[PDB]
Amino acid sequence: MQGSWSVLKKNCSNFFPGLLAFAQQTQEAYGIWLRIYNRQQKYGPTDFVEQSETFSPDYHKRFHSQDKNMWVDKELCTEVSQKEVARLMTYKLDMWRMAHCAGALLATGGYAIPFGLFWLANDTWVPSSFNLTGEELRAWREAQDLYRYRSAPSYLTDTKWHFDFHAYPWNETQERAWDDLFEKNDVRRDPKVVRPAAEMYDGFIKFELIRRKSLRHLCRSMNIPTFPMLARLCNGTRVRDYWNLAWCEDYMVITQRLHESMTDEELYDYAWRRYLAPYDKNLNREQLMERVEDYFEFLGPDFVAHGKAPNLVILTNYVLGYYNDPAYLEGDISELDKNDYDHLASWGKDAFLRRLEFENGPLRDQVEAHTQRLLAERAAIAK
Amino acid sequence: VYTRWKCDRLPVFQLKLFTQEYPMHAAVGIFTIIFLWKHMSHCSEETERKYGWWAGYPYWRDPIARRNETKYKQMIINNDVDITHPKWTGCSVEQLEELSRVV
Amino acid sequence: WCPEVRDRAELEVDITGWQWWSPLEERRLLPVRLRSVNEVREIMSKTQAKKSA
Amino acid sequence: SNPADHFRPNLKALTLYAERQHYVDRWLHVKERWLAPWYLPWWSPLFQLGTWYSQRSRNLFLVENHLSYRPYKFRRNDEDRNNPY
Amino acid sequence: MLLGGFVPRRFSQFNRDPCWMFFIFSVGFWLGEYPAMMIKYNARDLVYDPHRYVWSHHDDHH
Amino acid sequence: TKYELKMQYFDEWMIRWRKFQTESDWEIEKGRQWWRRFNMAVSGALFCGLVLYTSGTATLKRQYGLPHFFDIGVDGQAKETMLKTLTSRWRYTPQGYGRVLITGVPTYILFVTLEHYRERRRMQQYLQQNTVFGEQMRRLLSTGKIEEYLPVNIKATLPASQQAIYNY
Amino acid sequence: MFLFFFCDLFWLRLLLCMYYCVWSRLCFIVYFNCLMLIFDFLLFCLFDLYLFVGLCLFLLLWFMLFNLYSLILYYCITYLNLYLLFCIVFLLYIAFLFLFCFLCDFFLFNNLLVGDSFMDVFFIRFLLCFLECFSLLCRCLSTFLRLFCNLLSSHFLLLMFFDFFYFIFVFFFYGVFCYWFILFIFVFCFCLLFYVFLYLLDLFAAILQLFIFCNMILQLIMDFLLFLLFV
Amino acid sequence: VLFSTYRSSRLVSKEFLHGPVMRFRALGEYYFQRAWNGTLNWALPGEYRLYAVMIPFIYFYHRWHNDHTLDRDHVEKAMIMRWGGTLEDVRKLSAKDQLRVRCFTDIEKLYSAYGPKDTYLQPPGDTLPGKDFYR
Amino acid sequence: YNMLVFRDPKRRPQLSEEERAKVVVNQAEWPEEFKDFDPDDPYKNSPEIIKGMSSWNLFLWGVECAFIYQFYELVFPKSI
Amino acid sequence: GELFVRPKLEEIPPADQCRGFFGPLNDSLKFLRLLDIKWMMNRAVAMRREYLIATPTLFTFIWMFTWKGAVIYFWGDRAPPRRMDWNTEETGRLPLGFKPTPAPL
Numbered sequence A: 001m002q003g004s005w006s007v008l009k010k011n012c013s014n015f016f017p018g019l020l021a022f023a024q025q026t027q028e029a030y031g032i033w034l035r036i037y038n039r040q041q042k043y044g045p046t047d048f049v050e051q052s053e054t055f056s057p058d059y060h061k062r063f064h065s066q067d068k069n070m071w072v073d074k075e076l077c078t079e080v081s082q083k084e085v086a087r088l089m090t091y092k093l094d095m096w097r098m099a100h101c102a103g104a105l106l107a108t109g110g111y112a113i114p115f116g117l118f119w120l121a122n123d124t125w126v127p128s129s130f131n132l133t134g135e136e137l138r139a140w141r142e143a144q145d146l147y148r149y150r151s152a153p154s155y156l157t158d159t160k161w162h163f164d165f166h167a168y169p170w171n172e173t174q175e176r177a178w179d180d181l182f183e184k185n186d187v188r189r190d191p192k193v194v195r196p197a198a199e200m201y202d203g204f205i206k207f208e209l210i211r212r213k214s215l216r217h218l219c220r221s222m223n224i225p226t227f228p229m230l231a232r233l234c235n236g237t238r239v240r241d242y243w244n245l246a247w248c249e250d251y252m253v254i255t256q257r258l259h260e261s262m263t264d265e266e267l268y269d270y271a272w273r274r275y276l277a278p279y280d281k282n283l284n285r286e287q288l289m290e291r292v293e294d295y296f297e298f299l300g301p302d303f304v305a306h307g308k309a310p311n312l313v314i315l316t317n318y319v320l321g322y323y324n325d326p327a328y329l330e331g332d333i334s335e336l337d338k339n340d341y342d343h344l345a346s347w348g349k350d351a352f353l354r355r356l357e358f359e360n361g362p363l364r365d366q367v368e369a370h371t372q373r374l375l376a377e378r379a380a381i382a383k
Numbered sequence B: 001v002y003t004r005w006k007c008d009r010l011p012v013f014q015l016k017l018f019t020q021e022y023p024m025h026a027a028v029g030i031f032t033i034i035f036l037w038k039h040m041s042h043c044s045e046e047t048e049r050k051y052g053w054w055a056g057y058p059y060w061r062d063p064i065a066r067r068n069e070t071k072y073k074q075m076i077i078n079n080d081v082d083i084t085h086p087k088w089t090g091c092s093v094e095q096l097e098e099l100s101r102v103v
Numbered sequence C: 001w002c003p004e005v006r007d008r009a010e011l012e013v014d015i016t017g018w019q020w021w022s023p024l025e026e027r028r029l030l031p032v033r034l035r036s037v038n039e040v041r042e043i044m045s046k047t048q049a050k051k052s053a
Numbered sequence D: 001s002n003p004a005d006h007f008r009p010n011l012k013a014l015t016l017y018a019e020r021q022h023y024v025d026r027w028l029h030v031k032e033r034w035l036a037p038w039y040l041p042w043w044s045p046l047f048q049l050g051t052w053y054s055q056r057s058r059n060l061f062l063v064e065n066h067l068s069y070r071p072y073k074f075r076r077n078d079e080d081r082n083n084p085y
Numbered sequence E: 001m002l003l004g005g006f007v008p009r010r011f012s013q014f015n016r017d018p019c020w021m022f023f024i025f026s027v028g029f030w031l032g033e034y035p036a037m038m039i040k041y042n043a044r045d046l047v048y049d050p051h052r053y054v055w056s057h058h059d060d061h062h
Numbered sequence F: 001t002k003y004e005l006k007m008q009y010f011d012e013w014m015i016r017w018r019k020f021q022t023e024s025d026w027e028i029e030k031g032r033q034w035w036r037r038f039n040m041a042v043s044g045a046l047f048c049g050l051v052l053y054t055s056g057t058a059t060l061k062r063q064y065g066l067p068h069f070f071d072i073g074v075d076g077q078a079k080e081t082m083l084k085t086l087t088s089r090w091r092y093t094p095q096g097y098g099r100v101l102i103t104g105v106p107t108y109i110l111f112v113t114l115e116h117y118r119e120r121r122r123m124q125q126y127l128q129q130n131t132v133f134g135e136q137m138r139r140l141l142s143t144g145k146i147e148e149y150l151p152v153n154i155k156a157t158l159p160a161s162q163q164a165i166y167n168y
Numbered sequence G: 001m002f003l004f005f006f007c008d009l010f011w012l013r014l015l016l017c018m019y020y021c022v023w024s025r026l027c028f029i030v031y032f033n034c035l036m037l038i039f040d041f042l043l044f045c046l047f048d049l050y051l052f053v054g055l056c057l058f059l060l061l062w063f064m065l066f067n068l069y070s071l072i073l074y075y076c077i078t079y080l081n082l083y084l085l086f087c088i089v090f091l092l093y094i095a096f097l098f099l100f101c102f103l104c105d106f107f108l109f110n111n112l113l114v115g116d117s118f119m120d121v122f123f124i125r126f127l128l129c130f131l132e133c134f135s136l137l138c139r140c141l142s143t144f145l146r147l148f149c150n151l152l153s154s155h156f157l158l159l160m161f162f163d164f165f166y167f168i169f170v171f172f173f174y175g176v177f178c179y180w181f182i183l184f185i186f187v188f189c190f191c192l193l194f195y196v197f198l199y200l201l202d203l204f205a206a207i208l209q210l211f212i213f214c215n216m217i218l219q220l221i222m223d224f225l226l227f228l229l230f231v
Numbered sequence H: 001v002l003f004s005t006y007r008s009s010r011l012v013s014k015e016f017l018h019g020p021v022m023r024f025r026a027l028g029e030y031y032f033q034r035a036w037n038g039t040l041n042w043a044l045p046g047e048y049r050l051y052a053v054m055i056p057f058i059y060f061y062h063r064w065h066n067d068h069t070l071d072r073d074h075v076e077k078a079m080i081m082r083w084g085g086t087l088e089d090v091r092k093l094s095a096k097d098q099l100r101v102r103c104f105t106d107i108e109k110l111y112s113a114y115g116p117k118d119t120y121l122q123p124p125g126d127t128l129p130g131k132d133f134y135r
Numbered sequence I: 001y002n003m004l005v006f007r008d009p010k011r012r013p014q015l016s017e018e019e020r021a022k023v024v025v026n027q028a029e030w031p032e033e034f035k036d037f038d039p040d041d042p043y044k045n046s047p048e049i050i051k052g053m054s055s056w057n058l059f060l061w062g063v064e065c066a067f068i069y070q071f072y073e074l075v076f077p078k079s080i
Numbered sequence J: 001g002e003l004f005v006r007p008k009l010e011e012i013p014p015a016d017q018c019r020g021f022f023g024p025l026n027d028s029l030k031f032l033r034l035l036d037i038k039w040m041m042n043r044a045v046a047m048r049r050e051y052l053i054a055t056p057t058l059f060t061f062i063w064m065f066t067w068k069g070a071v072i073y074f075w076g077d078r079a080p081p082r083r084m085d086w087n088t089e090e091t092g093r094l095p096l097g098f099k100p101t102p103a104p105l
């Protein structure tokens, strides 16, 4: 979304109340995260707590491993509720953006003020706390959805093009899953058909081998600030933490069937944090429930059985596929009755163009026959 | 759909290209530019006479001397420099007057 | 008036996908064609047998 | 000689001269003007980036104690190998 | 890449396309400048500069 | 206070008029260089310590575990001692931006503070000098401008074989 | 010293603006190997091996606008300087080298230590590693030197031959009207043949040298690429 | 907020200077947008007429520049050095004398290294002025 | 054919001999520009761009331009 | 060329098997392993840690080809002359009777 004066006024008016609300949310989220971190350190697996090293097979660069460095706390409901987890995730996003802004301010002293003016003129990178009314929150959500639309297609195309150019599926079912994975949101994708793509891509690329450019595109699509990007293991850590929290909340909801009892707005927010339900689509409860059930089905029974989610890259592609709107087409079909090269009519045809028209026109067969006969006669005379 | 080359304006695309596509090359280019302007940005008068002119240095008018004369006149006039000061001449003003009367 | 092709090409190029040939995808999709009536009959018979069993 | 002269740029338009001292001093004045305001603390990375490397280079130059002679960078004649002055 | 275009079969056809007309004009200039130089620089009345030994590029570049 | 903005002009002038550099000023600059090196060393030690403290447990086990390159016996003893010391207590082992900040911000702050205060110390030292450089520094801090050709204006000391210019 | 000058491409820039205001396909490329690095299917690389395509294409365009058009008399190669070419090659080569080094994967350099464990480490393998580390920089220097010298020599030869041809054509054409016309005709035919041969040789050599210039960079890149197999 | 980062933010109407732009595009497209106009890395087209038209024009303007701007300097230097060493001394001559001198310079250029050396080497016993004539 | 390095393109035949033999040629429908069409000289009857302007006339025009360029100073010399 | 896999802990030969310039530096000579460069090279090769030999070399070359080369060329100290112009330590001191300006206060 582009900046505007109205949004600038809105953010300037709500700047200090927004900061105060952000501080209160910071205290609350610090408490929640302290609880979660204590539980992880106490009951977490040895590899997860010790931060086991997983190196790539080509350049031996360490990155988070989905199996080892990600752990689902099935018993987190005792200490932390679902709403607390959602609050923590939202605060994590807001805190990331605020931390980047504060780092810029500290680095550049008082020279960041005009850049701050640019920042407050757009809702893309402002915290949710700056919105004090429903309309402001709706506009902020619209800006976030616009950024997601802007970013996701690049990530999807990167993944699909790299895989298709450097590899092909093994069997027909994998082919169908791969083809249906990257369909536009206007059609409904069956998670059962699409799931094998996860194993296929695990064969191709895991979350531990994700490239830095693809990571940048993903972070753009997740409304995660990317500047300064730095090494790939920082925003990678952010992504891992966010999706670990999301998986814990998803396990809690699936086990306790909270989504059925979840209200309409809370359900919409829950889907939105999973990048499943844009607000501009004006989805009803039926569609939200369908998408959430499809997401749970894609996670698969193994998620509940052992807390193991499918490949994170494929999961991100699948969820972001809802932001891959059909390519725009505006204009009545009658426009196809016009002509594009009328301005050349005055130039006419030169000798070469006339020759080409004569040779390849409706008389082409006659000219070909005459030419071939003449050439044959000349060749016979030569011999 | 959004694409950097088609949607962004030229300056924005330039910054993106040289910051997230070819940043190391830009850094090396800046390093080399700094080196060139720090060590290869001087030309002595003799070097200019030898190679600095297309057909050769026109000694019959010595434009370098005129250029330096204009430079020094401008500096003296603007900065209000007393070229008769003993440090410039190595002798007192009275000695300078004595020399002028002598020669 | 063929927006899907435009978007895919532009996105592929903007993500460093300069190459214009996709032998693997073509190999996967080259032999695709609408089936003949007899082939449809055979497929329907197979489906009916599967459903019955 | 003449064939060698054909490998020169053919669109030279203007040449400008400036002493190292003068433009270095002007650059220092600009840097001081932009780094002077109170809203840029001395501990900011920008200020250190501006000042520390220059200070280090100048200190290295001052500390230098070389047994050989380095001819003036901006002499009138530097083409004579047997006349460093 | 030299793939196609109008190609006159002989000289008389160079007037069948404006581009080749300009080309033949240029060729005429090119080839006719040489006889002009022959006539001008081998003329009977052409005289070497008396002061030619006063200065030369050979002493300048030396 | 921003001493670098004042001191840059003085340093440039000294480089331009380095001939009048007394041995005292040379010693001052050598001490400044030595203190810069010391600050670099201490900042690097702090950075290494912070990195080691925040290192992951598995990373520490791999680094300070078998095999031993030399296998002398002292190497293994030292590695085991360090590994036990690090793994005994609980350590905050962040990753990503957090580790970057923790390891860098303290180091940058320390290095910058030490360098700034050493620059102030050098300014004081040059103020206390009784040479032409000290006089130039005092005049710069008084009038705010650098007075070039000062050594010849006040007739600073010259070698016995070069005093003819002052003969006026 | 600040010299203000202009490149000799303004007319070519005008032509590019005129003829490329609308899209056109490209199917012939001087260095096509920058697009097809992998030939065995199921091999893929996590490194940005296709980052060099844009620079390769732009360099080819720039050097072709300069060198190929330099065959036209009085056309100027504005960039024809040894140290300028050194700066260009330094930029490209060192940028890619620092991209590989910033990866902070020391094992990537294991192949520098040539030979096997059988060879003496200190007296054979270490010397070979030294020589190869030197050879990288020598490859950079050789690339830039070759590019400079080819053009310099070709244009020197062209200028000298053209001067000789002008001299004989102007000051000895009258022999056509004389009894020794046959010798002049033979010499003129030989000169025409030589003119054509030199122009063809230079045309081919310019493109070939651009190909080699890009291939050296691509070889640098390939020397440190590792391909994973799909499963 | 001050300036847009998107090219979609138009500064003019779609019909601004439509006609001249269409004429310019017609000029561009007629010969270039053809199947046989296959470029080699965008620099070498496939249309013969493009070569036939562009090579002569390039040569013509380059030669005009070289003759009226570059070699003129050498010609003037020769005239000045050989006829007094000052511009006024040359201007003291008539136009015909200057023409003679410049044509002799052209002769020297044409001879280059493949011609008699008496044009710049004074044979012993020659009565013509030497190098110290004006000194 | 060729004019220096420029070679005249030739259309590849598309019809087989059997089909070709069954083709009836009617030059009455052909344009006047291309009648008795010859692959070795397809532009023999092509109209001139300018009526009465021959190739030799343009060649002579260029030669005259060269002569002017080389001889104008001889008749109207100018001082330095 | 091909992918590199680090050796397992059990695949690494013992230190005693490594050879130095003259011979193995076994018991009573272990502390000499630190000083023997060839022994360290052989140990690194045996442990597949060849980069310790290659990385320092290449980087060094780069450092010379990039930053130190020009520094030496432009600012390096050449060989001293036979007759040396030592400093008399007479320049710089203020003249007698000069009244230096007061220090800041």
Ligand SMILES: CCCCCCCCCCCCCCCCCC(=O)OC[C@H](COP(=O)([O-])OCC(O)COP(=O)([O-])OC[C@@H](COC(=O)CCCCCCCCCCCCCCCCC)OC(=O)CCCCCCCCCCCCCCCCC)OC(=O)CCCCCCCCCCCCCCCCC
Pocket (backbone or CB within 6 Å): A026, A029, A030, A033, A095, A096, A097, A098, A099, A100, A101, A102, A103, A104, A106, A107, A228, A234, A237, A238, A241, D043, D044, D045, F094, F095, F096, F097, F098, F099, F100, F101, F102, F103, F104, F105, F106, F108, F109, F110
């Ligand atoms: C005055 C000197 C200045 C020096 C120059 C500085 C120049 C600017 C550089 C940037 C400096 C920092 C800017 C503020 C950031 C805000 C604080 C913060 O870390 O936020 C958390 C957050 C952590 O991100 P993450 O990815 O979630 O962390 C992953 C970890 O696993 C997270 O671990 P976890 O998963 O276990 O979760 C833990 C989480 C759990 O907690 C929570 O969830 C609760 C919330 C906690 C965080 C709250 C942050 C709030 C931010 C907004 C503040 C208000 C802004 C208001 C603005 C308007 C004001 C009018 O709690 C944390 O966030 C703790 C993180 C670790 C602490 C990092 C701080 C270390 C430095 C401070 C100590 C310095 C001591 C000096 C001693 C000197 C001795 C001599 O910070 C960021 O978003 C990262 C920074 C983004 C910008 C990066 C820019 C480049 C930086 C390069 C630095 C290189 C070294 C320095 C030299 C530079 C030379 C070029």
Ligand SMILES: CCCCCCCCCCCCCCCCCC(=O)OC[C@H](COP(=O)([O-])OCC(O)COP(=O)([O-])OC[C@@H](COC(=O)CCCCCCCCCCCCCCCCC)OC(=O)CCCCCCCCCCCCCCCCC)OC(=O)CCCCCCCCCCCCCCCCC
Pocket (backbone or CB within 6 Å): A100, A101, A103, A104, A107, A108, A111, A125, A216, A225, A226, A227, A228, A229, A230, B010, B011, B014, B015, B016, B018, B019, B020, B023, B024, B026, B027, D034, D045, D046, D049
């Ligand atoms: C046709 C001609 C047209 C005109 C052309 C003009 C001529 C241009 C010629 C040359 C152009 C190419 C130059 C390339 C250079 C090499 C670049 C390179 O190697 O980059 C590697 C690498 C590439 O970056 P990346 O993170 O991988 O991704 C870059 C993408 O663009 C990230 O993209 P993304 O999509 O992933 O993320 C998008 C979004 C994502 O959203 C976010 O990230 C959220 C918002 C983040 C806000 C910023 C957070 C910063 C946190 C602290 C960073 C560390 C600070 C270190 C300490 C301070 C050092 C100064 O981020 C943003 O929207 C960033 C907004 C930044 C706006 C400022 C851009 C510059 C405009 C000019 C202003 C300055 C003018 C000075 C000169 C004039 C003075 C009178 O750079 C970095 O790692 C970034 C380090 C940044 C350090 C701070 C800046 C240092 C430079 C000096 C600053 C001086 C300030 C002076 C202030 C005023 C004094 C009076």
Ligand SMILES: CCCCCCCCCCCCCCCCCC(=O)OC[C@H](COP(=O)([O-])OCC(O)COP(=O)([O-])OC[C@@H](COC(=O)CCCCCCCCCCCCCCCCC)OC(=O)CCCCCCCCCCCCCCCCC)OC(=O)CCCCCCCCCCCCCCCCC
Pocket (backbone or CB within 6 Å): D060, F033, F036, F037, F038, F040, F041, F043, F044, F045, F048, F049, G098, G101, G102, G103, G104, J059, J060, J062, J063, J066, J067, J068, J071
């Ligand atoms: C990650 C990157 C990967 C990609 C790489 C891509 C590039 C390719 C790689 C190759 C590089 C290409 C070059 C590109 C251009 C870059 C710029 C450039 O060349 O600038 C050079 C440029 C050269 O200077 P210059 O301008 O030519 O002027 C020359 C003057 O010397 C300047 O004067 P100054 O006042 O600035 O002083 C400079 C000073 C710099 O040094 C210092 O200031 C002092 C030392 C600083 C130490 C820093 C911290 C180190 C760690 C501390 C301890 C940690 C552990 C703590 C716990 C311990 C527990 C027990 O050096 C000296 O002057 C020499 C002093 C040496 C004293 C030796 C005394 C004798 C006893 C000690 C040695 C012998 C021990 C024998 C033991 C035997 C036992 C059996 O700048 C410098 O080198 C100096 C300034 C920067 C200093 C940075 C210091 C940190 C360096 C990194 C250390 C850590 C990483 C390395 C190890 C990694 C292991 C995994």
Ligand SMILES: CCCCCCCCCCCCCCCCCC(=O)OC[C@H](COP(=O)([O-])OCC(O)COP(=O)([O-])OC[C@@H](COC(=O)CCCCCCCCCCCCCCCCC)OC(=O)CCCCCCCCCCCCCCCCC)OC(=O)CCCCCCCCCCCCCCCCC
Pocket (backbone or CB within 6 Å): A060, A061, A062, A063, A230, A231, A232, A233, A234, D045, D046, D048, D049, D052, D053, F043, F048, F051, F094, F095, F096, F097, F099, F100, F103, F104, F105, F107, F108, F111, G104, J059, J063
């Ligand atoms: C205006 C400000 C100007 C600032 C200038 C200073 C530089 C820029 C400042 C910072 C800018 C912001 C961005 C920095 C890069 C961020 C990278 C990143 O994303 O890291 C994420 C990463 C977090 O990810 P993680 O998953 O938690 O852990 C990484 C994984 O382990 C990763 O796992 P892995 O599988 O990748 O494991 C490999 C990993 C393992 O490494 C690590 O990640 C561990 C952390 C680094 C350890 C480094 C120390 C190693 C030991 C050194 C021993 C030295 C002994 C010397 C003794 C000398 C005795 C005389 O990487 C390595 O192996 C690399 C080792 C380093 C090799 C160094 C080679 C240097 C060659 C030098 C050539 C010659 C130079 C010239 C000549 C000099 C001599 C004359 O961060 C870190 O691990 C540490 C980040 C530290 C950031 C830099 C802090 C800067 C502090 C500056 C203080 C001084 C300021 C001075 C100001 C002056 C006035 C203006």
Ligand SMILES: CCCCCCCCCCCCCCCCCC(=O)OC[C@H](COP(=O)([O-])OCC(O)COP(=O)([O-])OC[C@@H](COC(=O)CCCCCCCCCCCCCCCCC)OC(=O)CCCCCCCCCCCCCCCCC)OC(=O)CCCCCCCCCCCCCCCCC
Pocket (backbone or CB within 6 Å): D016, G002, G003, G004, G005, G006, G007
């Ligand atoms: C003191 C005497 C004066 C001089 C002062 C100089 C001060 C110097 C300060 C110290 C600098 C130190 C460092 C110097 C390093 C130099 C290195 C160097 O030369 O490298 C060669 C290198 C050669 O590059 P290149 O490959 O030839 O390509 C560069 C070209 O510019 C072509 O590249 P491109 O085509 O890719 O560029 C993009 C191009 C894209 O293409 C275009 O846009 C096409 C147009 C191209 C224009 C540029 C080409 C210029 C051609 C020659 C001049 C044209 C005629 C001028 C007539 C002057 C008559 C006296 O677009 C533009 O150029 C944008 C500008 C368009 C302007 C349009 C203006 C329209 C006005 C309409 C008004 C209507 C009023 C109606 C009123 C009605 C009332 C009723 O030069 C550069 O790269 C640029 C060097 C510039 C360095 C900065 C200099 C400082 C700025 C000085 C500005 C002075 C303005 C005041 C002048 C007033 C008249 C006297």
Ligand SMILES: CCCCCCCCCCCCCCCCCC(=O)OC[C@H](COP(=O)([O-])OCC[N+](C)(C)C)OC(=O)CCCCCCCCCCCCCCCCC
Pocket (backbone or CB within 6 Å): B031, B032, B034, B035, B038, D053, D057, D060, D061, G083, G084, G086, G087, G090, J065, J066, J067, J068, J069, J070, J071, J074, J075
């Ligand atoms: C007729 C004679 C002909 C002679 C011909 C000789 C060959 C000339 C070839 C020229 C063309 C080819 C050029 C190739 C490129 C060469 C590059 C080169 O050598 O450059 C070296 C030079 C070295 O610079 P320097 O010469 O100013 O070195 C300073 C050293 N002292 C102070 C001791 C004198 O690089 C530069 O000039 C650029 C310097 C600025 C950019 C880098 C800044 C960061 C430095 C980091 C380390 C130090 C600071 C601490 C860390 C950072 C903290 C923030």
Ligand SMILES: CCCCCCCC/C=C/CCCCCCCC(=O)OC[C@H](COP(=O)(O)OCCN)OC(=O)CCCCCCC/C=C/CCCCCCCC
Pocket (backbone or CB within 6 Å): H001, H002, H003, H004, H009, H010, H011
């Ligand atoms: C931000 C200014 C705050 C203070 C108020 C200054 C008002 C000065 C008087 C201005 C009168 C003329 C205004 C004409 C309309 C300007 C429209 C404009 O700014 O558009 C920018 C437009 C580019 O737009 P795009 O990026 O393509 O897309 C825009 C949509 N996002 O820029 C232009 O075309 C240039 C227009 C320049 C107009 C003049 C601006 C003058 C500003 C001066 C500010 C300094 C204070 C002046 C005080 C004056 C007191 C009498």
Ligand SMILES: CCCCCCCCCCCCO[C@@H]1O[C@H](CO)[C@@H](O[C@H]2O[C@H](CO)[C@@H](O)[C@H](O)[C@H]2O)[C@H](O)[C@H]1O
Pocket (backbone or CB within 6 Å): F027, F030, F031, F032, F034, F042
């Ligand atoms: C957080 C750390 C805070 C540290 C605060 C201060 C701690 C107490 C003082 C530390 C010791 C200082 O003592 C320091 O000794 C060295 C010599 O060894 C002196 O250095 C002197 O001799 C060395 C000898 O090589 C010369 O290179 C140097 O040019 C010269 O100045 C320093 O001028 C002096 O300051």
